[PDB]
């Protein structure tokens, strides 16, 4: 079940790049040279870079001259490091990756758009969406995948109408109906898959990084909005 | 185990959608309106489309449509379909979807550049490795001295001790060589070194993996060390 932060992370790095034709397979491995961390920097800030950096990264000791002028792109922005150096992810340590990816997912997908932390603020975001429901938590609250077409419906009003009667003895069938209808009229793209986040055993910041894309989403024109 | 068909099957769609700054995530859902189902066609078979489809496929009606210009065009294009229909694809039935992507890896990945394909594709890495007898696309590659093997033999100096290497650290032997064909012969990892490894892979999986080997380039600042 650890996978899925990784897979989620991961997803969420290449609908960034996509946007430059670049693609990540491996967070372990296909950010140590450095060469897509800074691709990825430059998509996400839509600046370029202060300084050059190595085109042929042929030892180590240019793959850690590229991840420190990203680092250092990444520190004079105001973007606060919990602890990851050069040599972490060059030597590709898969924790302090995820560290880092998820410090980029909160300064850039959760709190740069929407007194209080970027977490209370989107579960704020939720939470008047959804008055009628009472959500707290980013879990369980989520498993049945009615919360899921509750959302989806909040936010265009005919894309999940019936969500209220829907079986919630079928977790997975309920999220891939709300994440379709999501993905294929408001353009919210499946970085998390239904049988993920209905799992028994999701993260918080795995399903946070999901619902982060909602708050600027926008209705497509040939939407099949009913009433039911 | 049955994950790995599945997920190899995604990321290699994804590395041609990259092209035209396109996406799927899932591979039961993202191609049912039949949108991303053509620009993964286009941009394989480098022609448009014999005729215009729905831009706003409201209705399954239309996504029926979207699909079925999709198939014409893939009829059309002399490629054999294992009855695969719209409905098929379009109502999400998974397994009907990974024969219909399989079809495409075969004929474009596989047969298109270099007896049946899958034994021309054997017979290519036979004389790229003559010192190891290799016959399948599983239990030959599971150790991950074969791909040290292949990587070190399409250039000299990528892998040059992969005959030294620990057979019995297949993820660290799989990483190192994939590693390397990555960086230095653009050889992407539509399947990752604990998926290849995996005492269940498929040979499919691994098939179209190593399909990206026969017309890989070499980059100019590759670091190759004798040893």
Redesign the interface.
Same mark, same amino acid.
Request: some cysteine; overall charge positive.
């Given at each position: 079940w650890k996978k899925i932060q990784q897979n989620t992370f991961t997803?969420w790095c $290449?609908?960034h790049? %996509?946007?430059v034709? %670049?693609?990540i397979? $491996?967070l !372990? #491995?296909?950010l140590s040279?450095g060469l897509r961390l800074i691709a990825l920097l430059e998509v996400l800030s839509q600046k370029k870079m202060h300084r050059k950096h190595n !085109?042929? +990264?042929?030892?180590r000791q240019m793959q850690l001259e590229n991840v420190s002028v990203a680092l250092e792109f990444l520190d004079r922005e105001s973007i606060k490091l919990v602890s990851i150096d050069s040599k972490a992810i060059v030597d590709g340590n898969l924790k302090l990756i995820l560290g880092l990816i998820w410090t980029l997912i909160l300064h850039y997908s959760i709190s740069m758009p929407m007194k209080q932390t970027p977490k209370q603020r989107l579960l704020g975001w939720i939470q008047n969406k959804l008055p009628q429901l009472p959500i707290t938590n980013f879990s369980r609250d989520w498993q049945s995948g009615r919360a899921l077409g509750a959302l989806v419906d909040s936010c265009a009003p005919g894309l999940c109408p019936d969500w209220d009667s829907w079986d919630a003895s079928k977790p997975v069938t309920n999220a891939?109906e709300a994440m !379709?209808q999501a =993905? =294929?009229w408001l353009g919210i +793209? !499946?970085?998390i #898959? +239904?049988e993920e986040i209905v799992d028994p055993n999701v993260d918080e910041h795995s399903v946070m990084t999901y619902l982060s894309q909602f708050p600027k989403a926008k209705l %497509?024109?040939?939407?099949?909005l009913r009433p039911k």
């Amino acid at each position: 079940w650890k996978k899925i932060q990784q897979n989620t992370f991961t997803r969420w790095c $290449n609908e960034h790049l %996509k946007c430059v034709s %670049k693609r990540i397979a $491996n967070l !372990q #491995t296909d950010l140590s040279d450095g060469l897509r961390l800074i691709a990825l920097l430059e998509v996400l800030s839509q600046k370029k870079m202060h300084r050059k950096h190595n !085109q042929r +990264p042929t030892f180590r000791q240019m793959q850690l001259e590229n991840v420190s002028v990203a680092l250092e792109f990444l520190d004079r922005e105001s973007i606060k490091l919990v602890s990851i150096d050069s040599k972490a992810i060059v030597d590709g340590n898969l924790k302090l990756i995820l560290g880092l990816i998820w410090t980029l997912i909160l300064h850039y997908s959760i709190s740069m758009p929407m007194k209080q932390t970027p977490k209370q603020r989107l579960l704020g975001w939720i939470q008047n969406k959804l008055p009628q429901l009472p959500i707290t938590n980013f879990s369980r609250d989520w498993q049945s995948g009615r919360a899921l077409g509750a959302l989806v419906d909040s936010c265009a009003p005919g894309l999940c109408p019936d969500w209220d009667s829907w079986d919630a003895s079928k977790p997975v069938t309920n999220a891939r109906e709300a994440m !379709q209808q999501a =993905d =294929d009229w408001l353009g919210i +793209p !499946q970085v998390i #898959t +239904p049988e993920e986040i209905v799992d028994p055993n999701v993260d918080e910041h795995s399903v946070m990084t999901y619902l982060s894309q909602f708050p600027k989403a926008k209705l %497509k024109p040939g939407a099949p909005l009913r009433p039911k």
